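Annex B. Sample input.
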Amino acid sequence: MARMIHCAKLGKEAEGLDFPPLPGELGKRLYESVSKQAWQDWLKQQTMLINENRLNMADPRARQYLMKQTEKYFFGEGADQASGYVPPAQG
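Annex B, continued. Sample output.
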């Protein structure tokens, strides 16, 4: 395992990114909340938002805009559910 955090995307104990996801203090709470499993989900909405807003991935404006969707999510309105599976991995 990488780090030691409680995957908020499910409600268990998974491995955290152990690194700053974005420039700012917010990321500090993202890597300490997200897990190696929930990470895959973060990428999902990432695209949906980029296409739903037509942001510029090339620029940080696309990453700074999504940061508001991750914070207000759990760190904000607060939403947690029990689901998901634990598939295999490689490398």
